[PDB]
Amino acid sequence: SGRGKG
Amino acid sequence: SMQEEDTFRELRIFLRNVTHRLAIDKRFRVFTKPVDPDEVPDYVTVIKQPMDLSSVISKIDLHKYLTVKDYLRDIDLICSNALEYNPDRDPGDRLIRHRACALRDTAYAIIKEELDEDFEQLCEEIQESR
16 A cells, blocks of 8 residues: 555 | 662553553554554555554563653654654544644653652663663
């Protein structure tokens, strides 16, 4: 994934 | 010099009460666990020195914190990791970044209002003597 959660 | 061990006992007990108060707070639940590798696979590639409140409670019991500065360095690490990893785009990103600052500020605020300066100073001087 790229940065950031959820 | 049981007084030095009583000082370190008293410090640990204090730090447990603070870390407990943070860990039971609903806002900081995300900081009670390590970051999920399966959900956030790129977290490890950004953050090389992870920290959370479970790690902190463990380090209190292992006698890793001899001063309040030592404890607050890890609290700061939790916050800076969150501000380092999360971007400032999505509202979920801004929610977590704000909670991280809140965690830091809350910790510093509790300590400022409840820690006696002469007790903090004592702990600082014992560790330097060693």
